[PDB]
Amino acid sequence: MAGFLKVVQLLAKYGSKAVQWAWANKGKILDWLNAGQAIDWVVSKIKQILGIK
């Protein structure tokens, strides 16, 4: 869970709703990281889902 919590910690700068989405989608995030997706790629993907631009 080291990559997952790095994702959540990087999202915390963006606020509670970003952290909220990450916890509810923990399995997606774990699956992306295990599929070879980088932590920074996952943070960007989540920001795109949230509409942070």
The CA distance from 37 to 40, in Å, is 8
Q: Which DSSP letter does residue 28 get?
A: H
Query: Is residue 33 within 8 Å of 8, Cβ to Cβ?
Result: no
State this model's resolution in angstroms. 1.0
Q: How do the domains of the chain map onto residue ranges?
A: 1-53
The CA distance from 31 to 34, in Å, is 5
Give the amino acid at 23: W
Query: Is residue 46 within 8 Å of 21, Cβ to Cβ?
Result: yes
The CA distance from 3 to 32, in Å, is 10
Structure token digits, residue 20: 């909220």
Query: Is residue 4 within 8 Å of 30, Cβ to Cβ?
Result: yes
Give the amino acid at 11: L
> Which residues contact residue 19 at a Cβ distance below 8 angstroms, ignoring those fewer than 6 apart?
8, 11, 12
